[PDB]
Protein backbone atom coordinates (compact mmCIF):
# COMPACT_ATOMS: atom_id res chain seq x y z
CA UNK A 1 0.00 0.00 0.00
CA UNK A 2 1.00 3.64 0.53
CA UNK A 3 0.45 4.54 4.18
CA UNK A 4 2.13 1.26 5.12
CA UNK A 5 5.16 2.21 3.03
CA UNK A 6 5.31 5.69 4.57
CA UNK A 7 5.08 4.19 8.05
CA UNK A 8 7.94 1.81 7.30
CA UNK A 9 9.92 4.71 5.85
CA UNK A 10 9.52 6.73 9.04
CA UNK A 11 10.26 3.78 11.34
CA UNK A 12 13.39 2.88 9.40
CA UNK A 13 14.58 6.48 9.45
CA UNK A 14 14.20 6.72 13.22
CA UNK A 15 15.80 3.31 13.78
CA UNK A 16 18.78 4.19 11.59
CA UNK A 17 19.19 7.53 13.35
CA UNK A 18 19.21 5.82 16.74
CA UNK A 19 21.60 3.10 15.58
CA UNK A 20 24.07 5.63 14.18
CA UNK A 21 23.82 7.80 17.29
CA UNK A 22 24.55 5.00 19.74
CA UNK A 23 27.23 3.55 17.46
CA UNK A 24 28.95 6.93 17.67
CA UNK A 25 28.36 7.17 21.43
CA UNK A 26 29.31 3.68 22.68
CA UNK A 27 33.09 3.37 22.14
CA UNK A 28 32.85 -0.38 21.54
CA UNK A 29 34.05 -0.23 17.94
CA UNK A 30 37.38 -2.04 18.15
CA UNK A 31 39.18 -4.63 20.26
CA UNK A 32 42.98 -4.68 20.22
CA UNK A 33 46.14 -4.17 22.27
CA UNK A 34 47.28 -0.63 22.94
CA UNK A 35 50.46 -0.43 25.10
CA UNK A 36 48.59 2.23 27.11
CA UNK A 37 47.56 -0.43 29.64
CA UNK A 38 50.09 -2.24 31.81
CA UNK A 39 54.81 -6.78 26.21
CA UNK A 40 52.63 -6.42 23.10
CA UNK A 41 50.15 -4.49 25.26
CA UNK A 42 46.98 -4.86 27.26
CA UNK A 43 43.49 -5.59 26.00
CA UNK A 44 41.18 -2.68 25.26
CA UNK A 45 37.79 -2.00 23.71
CA UNK A 46 38.49 1.18 21.78
CA UNK A 47 35.96 3.49 20.20
CA UNK A 48 35.46 6.44 17.89
CA UNK A 49 36.40 9.17 20.39
CA UNK A 50 37.91 7.59 23.51
CA UNK A 51 39.93 4.40 23.68
CA UNK A 52 39.18 2.51 26.85
CA UNK A 53 40.76 -0.35 28.79
CA UNK A 54 39.54 -3.50 30.51
CA UNK A 55 42.65 -5.00 32.15
CA UNK A 56 44.30 -4.38 35.49
CA UNK A 57 43.20 -1.85 38.07
CA UNK A 58 42.66 0.64 35.23
CA UNK A 59 39.59 -1.35 34.17
CA UNK A 60 36.53 0.89 33.94
CA UNK A 61 38.59 4.10 33.66
CA UNK A 62 39.60 5.55 30.33
CA UNK A 63 40.34 8.72 28.43
CA UNK A 64 40.14 10.49 25.08
CA UNK A 65 42.63 10.10 22.23
CA UNK A 66 44.99 12.50 20.47
CA UNK A 67 44.81 11.55 16.77
CA UNK A 68 48.03 13.57 16.35
CA UNK A 69 50.79 11.68 18.21
CA UNK A 70 53.77 12.69 16.05
CA UNK A 71 54.40 16.13 14.51
CA UNK A 72 53.31 17.37 11.08
CA UNK A 73 52.49 20.65 9.31
CA UNK A 74 49.56 22.38 11.00
CA UNK A 75 48.39 24.56 8.11
CA UNK A 76 49.03 22.07 5.29
CA UNK A 77 51.26 18.99 5.57
CA UNK A 78 49.86 16.16 3.43
CA UNK A 79 46.87 13.88 2.89
CA UNK A 80 47.80 12.26 6.21
CA UNK A 81 46.92 15.46 8.08
CA UNK A 82 43.55 15.75 6.33
CA UNK A 83 42.82 12.08 7.01
CA UNK A 84 43.61 12.46 10.70
CA UNK A 85 41.52 15.63 10.94
CA UNK A 86 38.54 13.89 9.34
CA UNK A 87 38.95 10.84 11.56
CA UNK A 88 39.13 12.97 14.71
CA UNK A 89 36.15 15.10 13.72
CA UNK A 90 34.23 12.04 12.50
CA UNK A 91 32.08 14.53 10.63
CA UNK A 92 30.97 11.96 8.07
CA UNK A 93 29.03 9.66 10.44
CA UNK A 94 27.62 12.73 12.17
CA UNK A 95 26.59 14.14 8.80
CA UNK A 96 24.95 10.82 7.97
CA UNK A 97 22.93 10.88 11.18
CA UNK A 98 21.93 14.50 10.56
CA UNK A 99 20.78 13.62 7.05
CA UNK A 100 18.75 10.69 8.37
CA UNK A 101 17.09 13.03 10.86
CA UNK A 102 16.29 15.55 8.14
CA UNK A 103 14.83 12.85 5.92
CA UNK A 104 12.67 11.66 8.78
CA UNK A 105 11.48 15.21 9.38
CA UNK A 106 10.67 15.68 5.70
CA UNK A 107 8.74 12.43 5.40
CA UNK A 108 6.83 13.09 8.62
CA UNK A 109 5.94 16.59 7.43
CA UNK A 110 4.77 15.07 4.14
CA UNK A 111 1.64 13.87 5.95
CA UNK A 112 0.71 17.53 6.14
CA UNK A 113 0.91 19.33 2.80
CA UNK A 114 -0.02 16.03 1.15
CA UNK A 115 -0.28 17.96 -2.13
CA UNK A 116 3.49 18.39 -2.33
CA UNK A 117 5.52 15.51 -3.75
CA UNK A 118 9.10 16.79 -3.76
CA UNK A 119 9.19 16.24 0.02
CA UNK A 120 9.61 12.48 -0.38
CA UNK A 121 12.19 13.02 -3.13
CA UNK A 122 14.24 15.22 -0.83
CA UNK A 123 13.94 12.63 1.93
CA UNK A 124 15.23 9.89 -0.36
CA UNK A 125 18.13 12.03 -1.54
CA UNK A 126 19.06 12.71 2.08
CA UNK A 127 18.93 9.02 2.99
CA UNK A 128 21.12 8.00 0.06
CA UNK A 129 23.65 10.73 0.84
CA UNK A 130 23.65 9.49 4.43
CA UNK A 131 24.56 6.02 3.21
CA UNK A 132 27.40 7.41 1.13
CA UNK A 133 28.72 9.43 4.06
CA UNK A 134 28.54 6.36 6.30
CA UNK A 135 30.56 4.21 3.93
CA UNK A 136 33.13 6.98 3.56
CA UNK A 137 33.32 7.25 7.33
CA UNK A 138 34.03 3.57 7.83
CA UNK A 139 36.63 3.66 5.06
CA UNK A 140 38.35 6.58 6.80
CA UNK A 141 38.21 4.87 10.19
CA UNK A 142 39.75 1.65 8.88
CA UNK A 143 42.41 3.45 6.85
CA UNK A 144 43.34 5.49 9.92
CA UNK A 145 43.60 2.46 12.22
CA UNK A 146 46.53 1.06 10.22
CA UNK A 147 49.95 1.07 11.87
CA UNK A 148 51.97 1.11 8.64
CA UNK A 149 51.52 -10.01 13.79
CA UNK A 150 48.98 -8.06 15.83
CA UNK A 151 45.29 -8.88 16.22
CA UNK A 152 42.09 -6.85 16.21
CA UNK A 153 38.33 -7.26 16.01
CA UNK A 154 35.22 -5.15 15.62
CA UNK A 155 32.37 -4.62 18.06
CA UNK A 156 28.64 -4.12 17.92
CA UNK A 157 28.90 -0.36 17.34
CA UNK A 158 30.58 -1.11 14.01
CA UNK A 159 27.79 -3.45 12.92
CA UNK A 160 25.23 -0.94 14.18
CA UNK A 161 26.65 1.70 11.86
CA UNK A 162 26.53 -0.79 9.02
CA UNK A 163 22.89 -1.58 9.76
CA UNK A 164 22.16 2.13 9.76
CA UNK A 165 23.64 2.36 6.27
CA UNK A 166 21.56 -0.57 5.04
CA UNK A 167 18.37 0.88 6.48
CA UNK A 168 19.18 4.24 4.92
CA UNK A 169 19.48 2.67 1.48
CA UNK A 170 16.26 0.70 1.89
CA UNK A 171 14.39 3.78 3.09
CA UNK A 172 15.67 5.80 0.14
CA UNK A 173 14.37 3.13 -2.22
CA UNK A 174 10.97 3.16 -0.51
CA UNK A 175 10.76 6.95 -0.56
CA UNK A 176 11.57 7.04 -4.26
CA UNK A 177 8.89 4.42 -4.90
CA UNK A 178 6.42 6.55 -2.94
CA UNK A 179 7.28 9.58 -5.06
CA UNK A 180 6.84 7.47 -8.20
CA UNK A 181 3.40 6.32 -7.10
CA UNK A 182 2.36 9.88 -6.24
CA UNK A 183 3.47 11.16 -9.63
CA UNK A 184 1.57 8.25 -11.18
CA UNK A 185 -1.60 9.41 -9.43
CA UNK A 186 -1.19 12.67 -11.40
CA UNK A 187 -2.74 11.36 -14.61
Amino acid sequence: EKGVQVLLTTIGAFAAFGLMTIAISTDYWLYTRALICNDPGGLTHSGLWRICCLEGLKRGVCVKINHFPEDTDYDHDSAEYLLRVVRASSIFPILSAILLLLGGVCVAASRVYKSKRNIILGAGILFVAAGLSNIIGVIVYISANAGEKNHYSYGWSFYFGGLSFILAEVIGVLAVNIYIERSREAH
Binding site: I125, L132, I135, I139, S143
Partner: protein, 405 residues
Amino acid sequence: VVVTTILESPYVMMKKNHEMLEGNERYEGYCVDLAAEIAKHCGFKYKLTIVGDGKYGARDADTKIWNGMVGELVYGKADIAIAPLTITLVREEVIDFSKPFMSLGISIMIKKPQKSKPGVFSFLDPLAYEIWMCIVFAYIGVSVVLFLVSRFSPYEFGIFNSLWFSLGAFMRQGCDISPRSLSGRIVGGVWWFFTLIIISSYTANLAAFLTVERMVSPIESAEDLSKQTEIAYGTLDSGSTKEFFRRSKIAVFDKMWTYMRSAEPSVFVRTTAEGVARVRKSKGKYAYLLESTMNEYIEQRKPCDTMKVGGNLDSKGYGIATPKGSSLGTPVNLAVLKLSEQGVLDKLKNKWWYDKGECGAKDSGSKEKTSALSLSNVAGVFYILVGGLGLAMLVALIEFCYKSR
Protein backbone atom coordinates in the same frame (compact mmCIF):
# COMPACT_ATOMS: atom_id res chain seq x y z
CA VAL B 1 106.19 1.15 28.35
CA VAL B 2 102.80 2.35 29.60
CA VAL B 3 100.08 2.65 26.95
CA THR B 4 97.31 5.22 27.27
CA THR B 5 93.87 4.72 25.74
CA ILE B 6 90.32 5.99 26.23
CA LEU B 7 86.84 4.49 26.56
CA GLU B 8 85.22 4.46 23.13
CA SER B 9 83.73 1.27 21.74
CA PRO B 10 84.88 -0.82 19.94
CA TYR B 11 88.30 0.74 20.51
CA VAL B 12 88.03 0.38 24.30
CA MET B 13 85.42 -1.64 26.16
CA MET B 14 85.63 -3.29 29.57
CA LYS B 15 85.32 -7.05 29.27
CA LYS B 16 82.13 -8.80 30.36
CA ASN B 17 84.17 -10.67 33.00
CA HIS B 18 86.37 -7.91 34.39
CA GLU B 19 85.26 -8.59 37.97
CA MET B 20 86.83 -12.07 37.76
CA LEU B 21 90.39 -12.72 36.57
CA GLU B 22 90.82 -9.15 35.37
CA GLY B 23 94.54 -9.35 34.64
CA ASN B 24 95.26 -7.37 31.48
CA GLU B 25 91.96 -8.52 29.95
CA ARG B 26 89.75 -6.15 31.95
CA TYR B 27 90.00 -3.90 28.87
CA GLU B 28 88.91 -5.00 25.41
CA GLY B 29 88.84 -3.27 22.06
CA TYR B 30 90.43 -2.78 18.67
CA CYS B 31 93.13 -0.58 20.19
CA VAL B 32 93.94 -3.33 22.70
CA ASP B 33 94.72 -5.92 20.03
CA LEU B 34 96.62 -3.31 18.03
CA ALA B 35 98.76 -2.40 21.04
CA ALA B 36 99.44 -6.08 21.64
CA GLU B 37 100.57 -6.57 18.04
CA ILE B 38 102.82 -3.51 17.95
CA ALA B 39 104.42 -4.25 21.32
CA LYS B 40 105.03 -7.80 20.11
CA HIS B 41 106.74 -6.42 17.00
CA CYS B 42 108.80 -3.94 19.04
CA GLY B 43 109.26 -6.36 21.94
CA PHE B 44 108.09 -3.97 24.65
CA LYS B 45 106.19 -4.28 27.92
CA TYR B 46 102.77 -2.64 28.20
CA LYS B 47 100.23 -2.41 31.01
CA LEU B 48 97.02 -0.89 29.71
CA THR B 49 96.07 2.42 31.30
CA ILE B 50 93.22 4.89 30.99
CA VAL B 51 93.42 8.67 31.27
CA GLY B 52 91.55 9.96 34.30
CA ASP B 53 90.41 12.90 32.19
CA GLY B 54 88.34 11.14 29.54
CA LYS B 55 88.56 14.26 27.39
CA TYR B 56 90.54 14.11 24.16
CA GLY B 57 93.74 16.04 23.65
CA ALA B 58 93.29 19.80 23.51
CA ARG B 59 94.98 22.91 24.85
CA ASP B 60 93.43 25.67 26.95
CA ALA B 61 94.16 29.01 25.31
CA ASP B 62 93.98 31.08 28.50
CA THR B 63 96.29 28.63 30.30
CA LYS B 64 98.55 27.28 27.51
CA ILE B 65 98.07 23.80 29.02
CA TRP B 66 96.96 20.54 27.42
CA ASN B 67 93.97 18.44 28.49
CA GLY B 68 93.97 14.74 27.66
CA MET B 69 96.38 12.06 26.51
CA VAL B 70 98.39 14.87 24.93
CA GLY B 71 99.19 16.07 28.44
CA GLU B 72 100.22 12.54 29.39
CA LEU B 73 102.59 12.23 26.44
CA VAL B 74 104.15 15.69 26.69
CA TYR B 75 104.48 15.54 30.49
CA GLY B 76 105.78 11.96 30.57
CA LYS B 77 102.95 10.39 32.56
CA ALA B 78 102.45 8.04 29.59
CA ASP B 79 105.04 6.53 27.26
CA ILE B 80 102.70 6.09 24.27
CA ALA B 81 99.08 6.62 23.27
CA ILE B 82 96.99 4.11 21.32
CA ALA B 83 93.48 5.51 20.89
CA PRO B 84 91.18 6.73 18.13
CA LEU B 85 93.31 9.87 18.06
CA THR B 86 93.23 11.96 14.89
CA ILE B 87 96.34 13.45 13.36
CA THR B 88 96.37 17.24 13.48
CA LEU B 89 98.73 20.17 13.08
CA VAL B 90 98.71 21.46 16.65
CA ARG B 91 99.23 18.02 18.18
CA GLU B 92 102.01 17.10 15.74
CA GLU B 93 104.03 20.14 16.86
CA VAL B 94 104.51 18.61 20.32
CA ILE B 95 104.42 14.83 19.71
CA ASP B 96 105.28 12.52 16.80
CA PHE B 97 102.41 10.53 15.33
CA SER B 98 102.78 7.44 13.18
CA LYS B 99 101.38 6.70 9.76
CA PRO B 100 97.61 6.17 9.95
CA PHE B 101 96.23 2.74 10.75
CA MET B 102 92.62 3.85 10.20
CA SER B 103 91.59 6.15 7.36
CA LEU B 104 88.20 7.77 7.70
CA GLY B 105 86.28 11.01 7.36
CA ILE B 106 83.00 12.76 7.92
CA SER B 107 80.02 10.81 6.61
CA ILE B 108 76.22 10.78 6.67
CA MET B 109 73.70 8.76 8.67
CA ILE B 110 69.97 8.42 7.99
CA LYS B 111 67.01 6.28 8.97
CA LYS B 112 67.01 3.01 7.09
CA PRO B 113 64.22 3.25 4.48
CA GLN B 114 61.19 1.13 5.29
CA LYS B 115 57.95 0.29 3.54
CA SER B 116 56.32 3.67 3.09
CA LYS B 117 52.77 4.23 4.25
CA PRO B 118 50.62 3.67 1.14
CA GLY B 119 48.94 6.87 0.06
CA VAL B 120 45.71 7.51 -1.71
CA PHE B 121 46.03 7.53 -5.49
CA SER B 122 48.83 4.97 -5.21
CA PHE B 123 46.96 2.77 -7.68
CA LEU B 124 48.28 5.05 -10.44
CA ASP B 125 51.88 4.29 -9.44
CA PRO B 126 52.48 1.49 -11.99
CA LEU B 127 51.85 3.97 -14.82
CA ALA B 128 53.58 7.32 -15.11
CA TYR B 129 51.32 10.35 -14.92
CA GLU B 130 52.26 11.19 -18.50
CA ILE B 131 50.77 7.88 -19.64
CA TRP B 132 47.52 8.67 -17.84
CA MET B 133 47.35 12.14 -19.38
CA CYS B 134 48.02 10.74 -22.85
CA ILE B 135 45.34 8.11 -22.19
CA VAL B 136 42.84 10.87 -21.49
CA PHE B 137 43.89 12.80 -24.58
CA ALA B 138 43.59 9.67 -26.73
CA TYR B 139 40.14 8.97 -25.30
CA ILE B 140 38.99 12.47 -26.23
CA GLY B 141 40.58 12.30 -29.66
CA VAL B 142 39.22 8.90 -30.63
CA SER B 143 35.75 9.89 -29.44
CA VAL B 144 35.94 13.07 -31.52
CA VAL B 145 37.14 11.18 -34.59
CA LEU B 146 34.28 8.71 -34.22
CA PHE B 147 31.77 11.54 -33.93
CA LEU B 148 33.09 13.27 -37.04
CA VAL B 149 33.52 10.19 -39.22
CA SER B 150 30.04 9.03 -38.23
CA ARG B 151 28.29 12.33 -38.93
CA PHE B 152 30.03 12.84 -42.28
CA SER B 153 29.86 9.21 -43.44
CA PRO B 154 26.87 7.30 -42.04
CA TYR B 155 26.20 3.68 -42.92
CA GLU B 156 23.61 7.08 -33.37
CA PHE B 157 27.30 7.83 -32.82
CA GLY B 158 26.92 11.36 -31.57
CA ILE B 159 29.53 12.89 -29.30
CA PHE B 160 27.89 11.63 -26.11
CA ASN B 161 27.45 8.04 -27.25
CA SER B 162 30.92 8.16 -28.81
CA LEU B 163 32.44 9.03 -25.44
CA TRP B 164 30.33 6.30 -23.85
CA PHE B 165 31.51 3.72 -26.39
CA SER B 166 35.17 4.64 -25.95
CA LEU B 167 34.91 4.55 -22.16
CA GLY B 168 33.16 1.18 -22.22
CA ALA B 169 35.84 -0.16 -24.55
CA PHE B 170 38.60 0.98 -22.19
CA MET B 171 37.00 -0.91 -19.29
CA ARG B 172 36.27 -4.08 -21.29
CA GLN B 173 32.64 -3.68 -20.21
CA GLY B 174 31.26 -4.00 -23.72
CA CYS B 175 29.12 -1.76 -25.85
CA ASP B 176 25.44 -1.11 -26.44
CA ILE B 177 26.24 -0.34 -30.10
CA SER B 178 29.02 -1.01 -32.58
CA PRO B 179 30.17 0.95 -35.64
CA ARG B 180 28.82 -0.31 -38.95
CA SER B 181 31.09 1.71 -41.27
CA LEU B 182 34.63 0.68 -42.15
CA SER B 183 36.05 3.87 -40.64
CA GLY B 184 34.25 3.52 -37.32
CA ARG B 185 35.23 -0.14 -37.22
CA ILE B 186 38.89 0.74 -37.82
CA VAL B 187 38.79 3.30 -35.02
CA GLY B 188 37.11 0.87 -32.66
CA GLY B 189 39.57 -1.92 -33.36
CA VAL B 190 42.57 0.32 -32.82
CA TRP B 191 41.13 1.67 -29.58
CA TRP B 192 40.52 -1.93 -28.50
CA PHE B 193 44.13 -2.91 -29.11
CA PHE B 194 45.28 0.14 -27.18
CA THR B 195 43.12 -0.76 -24.19
CA LEU B 196 44.26 -4.38 -24.21
CA ILE B 197 47.93 -3.41 -24.11
CA ILE B 198 47.41 -0.77 -21.45
CA ILE B 199 45.40 -2.96 -19.07
CA SER B 200 47.90 -5.79 -19.43
CA SER B 201 50.80 -3.44 -18.73
CA TYR B 202 49.09 -2.00 -15.65
CA THR B 203 48.41 -5.46 -14.26
CA ALA B 204 51.93 -6.71 -14.98
CA ASN B 205 53.72 -3.74 -13.45
CA LEU B 206 51.46 -3.90 -10.40
CA ALA B 207 52.40 -7.56 -10.00
CA ALA B 208 56.05 -6.55 -10.21
CA PHE B 209 55.62 -3.80 -7.62
CA LEU B 210 53.90 -6.20 -5.23
CA THR B 211 56.36 -9.05 -5.83
CA VAL B 212 59.74 -7.36 -5.24
CA GLU B 213 60.12 -4.40 -2.89
CA ARG B 214 62.87 -1.90 -3.72
CA MET B 215 63.16 0.95 -1.23
CA VAL B 216 65.43 3.73 -2.50
CA SER B 217 67.36 6.24 -0.42
CA PRO B 218 66.17 9.81 -1.07
CA ILE B 219 69.80 10.97 -0.97
CA GLU B 220 72.94 9.33 -2.32
CA SER B 221 75.50 12.06 -1.60
CA ALA B 222 76.04 15.34 0.24
CA GLU B 223 75.52 17.73 -2.67
CA ASP B 224 72.16 16.04 -3.26
CA LEU B 225 71.51 16.73 0.42
CA SER B 226 72.36 20.42 0.04
CA LYS B 227 70.16 20.79 -3.05
CA GLN B 228 66.97 20.18 -1.05
CA THR B 229 65.80 21.45 2.33
CA GLU B 230 63.10 18.97 3.39
CA ILE B 231 65.55 16.93 5.48
CA ALA B 232 67.58 18.20 8.42
CA TYR B 233 71.30 18.19 9.18
CA GLY B 234 73.02 17.40 12.45
CA THR B 235 76.35 17.88 14.19
CA LEU B 236 77.59 17.37 17.72
CA ASP B 237 77.74 20.86 19.18
CA SER B 238 81.40 20.75 20.27
CA GLY B 239 83.20 18.53 17.78
CA SER B 240 85.54 18.84 14.86
CA THR B 241 82.78 18.51 12.26
CA LYS B 242 81.22 21.82 13.31
CA GLU B 243 84.57 23.62 13.09
CA PHE B 244 85.31 22.01 9.73
CA PHE B 245 82.02 23.34 8.38
CA ARG B 246 82.69 26.72 10.00
CA ARG B 247 86.16 27.27 8.51
CA SER B 248 85.31 25.70 5.16
CA LYS B 249 85.36 27.67 1.92
CA ILE B 250 83.82 25.20 -0.55
CA ALA B 251 80.40 26.13 -1.89
CA VAL B 252 78.50 23.07 -0.71
CA PHE B 253 79.81 23.02 2.84
CA ASP B 254 79.40 26.78 3.22
CA LYS B 255 75.78 26.34 2.12
CA MET B 256 75.36 23.61 4.72
CA TRP B 257 76.82 25.92 7.36
CA THR B 258 74.38 28.67 6.41
CA TYR B 259 71.47 26.24 6.63
CA MET B 260 72.59 24.78 9.96
CA ARG B 261 73.09 28.27 11.39
CA SER B 262 69.79 29.72 10.14
CA ALA B 263 67.62 26.64 10.82
CA GLU B 264 65.31 25.98 13.76
CA PRO B 265 64.78 24.05 15.94
CA SER B 266 68.40 23.49 16.99
CA VAL B 267 69.92 20.96 14.60
CA PHE B 268 72.93 20.52 16.87
CA VAL B 269 73.01 18.10 19.79
CA ARG B 270 75.12 17.69 22.92
CA THR B 271 75.85 14.00 22.27
CA THR B 272 75.98 11.57 19.36
CA ALA B 273 73.35 9.50 21.16
CA GLU B 274 70.87 12.37 20.87
CA GLY B 275 71.54 12.69 17.15
CA VAL B 276 71.16 8.97 16.48
CA ALA B 277 67.93 8.98 18.49
CA ARG B 278 66.63 11.92 16.45
CA VAL B 279 67.49 10.09 13.23
CA ARG B 280 65.82 6.89 14.44
CA LYS B 281 62.60 8.58 15.55
CA SER B 282 62.37 11.43 13.04
CA LYS B 283 61.28 8.86 10.43
CA GLY B 284 63.79 9.88 7.77
CA LYS B 285 63.68 13.67 8.17
CA TYR B 286 66.98 13.92 10.08
CA ALA B 287 70.50 13.36 8.75
CA TYR B 288 73.44 13.24 11.16
CA LEU B 289 77.02 14.03 10.12
CA LEU B 290 79.60 12.12 12.15
CA GLU B 291 82.78 10.11 11.68
CA SER B 292 82.57 7.11 9.39
CA THR B 293 83.93 4.50 11.79
CA MET B 294 81.28 5.19 14.42
CA ASN B 295 78.61 5.17 11.72
CA GLU B 296 79.76 1.76 10.49
CA TYR B 297 79.76 0.45 14.07
CA ILE B 298 76.26 1.80 14.71
CA GLU B 299 74.90 0.39 11.45
CA GLN B 300 75.83 -3.10 12.72
CA ARG B 301 74.19 -2.63 16.14
CA LYS B 302 70.55 -3.36 16.89
CA PRO B 303 67.92 -2.19 16.23
CA CYS B 304 69.75 -1.86 12.89
CA ASP B 305 67.67 1.19 11.97
CA THR B 306 70.44 3.26 10.34
CA MET B 307 72.84 3.12 7.42
CA LYS B 308 75.74 5.11 6.06
CA VAL B 309 75.04 6.81 2.73
CA GLY B 310 77.46 8.48 0.38
CA GLY B 311 81.21 8.77 0.47
CA ASN B 312 83.22 10.94 2.84
CA LEU B 313 83.35 14.72 3.04
CA ASP B 314 86.93 14.78 4.34
CA SER B 315 90.07 12.70 4.82
CA LYS B 316 91.49 12.01 8.27
CA GLY B 317 93.51 9.34 10.00
CA TYR B 318 93.89 7.83 13.44
CA GLY B 319 97.51 7.84 14.50
CA ILE B 320 99.51 6.25 17.29
CA ALA B 321 101.46 8.91 19.18
CA THR B 322 104.79 8.97 20.99
CA PRO B 323 106.60 11.75 22.86
CA LYS B 324 109.20 13.72 20.95
CA GLY B 325 112.65 12.18 21.20
CA SER B 326 111.44 8.65 21.92
CA SER B 327 112.82 5.48 20.37
CA LEU B 328 109.51 3.61 20.08
CA GLY B 329 108.27 6.03 17.42
CA THR B 330 110.26 4.53 14.56
CA PRO B 331 109.47 0.87 15.40
CA VAL B 332 105.76 1.67 15.68
CA ASN B 333 105.89 3.66 12.44
CA LEU B 334 107.27 0.53 10.79
CA ALA B 335 104.92 -1.80 12.66
CA VAL B 336 101.70 -0.14 11.51
CA LEU B 337 102.92 -0.50 7.92
CA LYS B 338 103.76 -4.14 8.65
CA LEU B 339 100.21 -4.82 9.80
CA SER B 340 98.62 -2.83 6.96
CA GLU B 341 100.60 -4.67 4.29
CA GLN B 342 100.01 -8.10 5.82
CA GLY B 343 96.30 -7.60 6.48
CA VAL B 344 96.01 -7.54 10.26
CA LEU B 345 94.21 -4.19 10.40
CA ASP B 346 91.60 -5.22 7.85
CA LYS B 347 90.97 -8.43 9.78
CA LEU B 348 90.48 -6.49 13.02
CA LYS B 349 88.13 -4.11 11.21
CA ASN B 350 86.04 -7.08 10.10
CA LYS B 351 86.38 -8.46 13.63
CA TRP B 352 84.92 -5.59 15.66
CA TRP B 353 82.60 -4.08 13.02
CA TYR B 354 81.30 -6.74 10.62
CA ASP B 355 81.77 -9.83 12.75
CA LYS B 356 79.93 -9.35 16.03
CA GLY B 357 77.25 -7.79 13.86
CA GLU B 358 74.06 -7.56 15.89
CA CYS B 359 72.59 -7.06 12.42
CA GLY B 360 73.20 -9.45 9.54
CA ALA B 361 74.79 -9.16 6.11
CA LYS B 362 73.75 -6.63 3.45
CA ASP B 363 70.66 -8.77 2.72
CA SER B 364 69.96 -11.02 5.71
CA GLY B 365 66.45 -11.82 4.48
CA SER B 366 64.58 -11.89 1.19
CA LYS B 367 61.23 -12.83 -0.34
CA GLU B 368 59.39 -11.66 2.76
CA LYS B 369 55.95 -13.27 2.93
CA THR B 370 53.72 -10.99 0.89
CA SER B 371 50.97 -9.05 2.62
CA ALA B 372 47.37 -9.02 1.48
CA LEU B 373 46.26 -5.69 0.08
CA SER B 374 44.73 -3.41 2.70
CA LEU B 375 42.01 -0.81 2.38
CA SER B 376 44.65 1.92 2.56
CA ASN B 377 46.02 0.74 -0.79
CA VAL B 378 42.74 1.11 -2.68
CA ALA B 379 40.89 3.70 -0.61
CA GLY B 380 41.39 6.38 -3.24
CA VAL B 381 39.24 4.52 -5.75
CA PHE B 382 36.51 4.24 -3.11
CA TYR B 383 36.70 8.00 -2.58
CA ILE B 384 36.49 8.54 -6.34
CA LEU B 385 33.50 6.22 -6.55
CA VAL B 386 31.56 8.05 -3.85
CA GLY B 387 32.45 11.42 -5.32
CA GLY B 388 31.18 10.26 -8.69
CA LEU B 389 27.90 9.12 -7.16
CA GLY B 390 27.43 12.47 -5.45
CA LEU B 391 28.22 14.26 -8.70
CA ALA B 392 25.70 12.08 -10.53
CA MET B 393 22.92 12.92 -8.08
CA LEU B 394 23.85 16.60 -8.30
CA VAL B 395 23.69 16.52 -12.10
CA ALA B 396 20.34 14.74 -12.03
CA LEU B 397 18.89 17.38 -9.71
CA ILE B 398 20.29 20.15 -11.91
CA GLU B 399 18.64 18.62 -14.97
CA PHE B 400 15.41 18.25 -13.01
CA CYS B 401 15.36 21.92 -12.07
CA TYR B 402 16.37 23.07 -15.56
CA LYS B 403 13.67 21.05 -17.31
CA SER B 404 10.92 21.79 -14.79
CA ARG B 405 11.59 25.52 -15.27
